[PDB]
# Entry
Amino acid sequence: PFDNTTYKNLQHHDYSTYTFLDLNLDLSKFRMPQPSSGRESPRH
Amino acid sequence: VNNTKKWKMEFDTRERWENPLMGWASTADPLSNLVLTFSTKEDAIAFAEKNGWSYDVEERKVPKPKSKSYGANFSWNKRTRVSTK
# Structure
């Protein structure tokens, strides 16, 4: 049924201090190979 | 750079010794404070040759033109990135 009274965004009550970084570690496999500037750093 | 606009004529610095009484800088060179000002080099050389002074001439040193780019500080693949700002 349709509902408009309950707050559906309850997932952030159970985020720890490493939630963002574990999600980035999970997402690191879904991504394209990064572009290269041809050098390792501008001091190279 | 306003003091670098005109040609100067100075002389060789002669002896400056110590005053025995006060420690002041004594001199015997009359031309030790004599600095002249010329618009061009050729006026200066003509004045030195007219007065019988032996001279030597340094040419004017202008700073060479620089290629300034503020965008070069944030390049993609060059070493000219700044590490901070």
Q: What stands out?
A: Chain A has one helix and no strands. The first helix of chain A runs from residue 19 to 27. The CA atoms of residues 4 and 30 of chain A lie 35 Å apart.
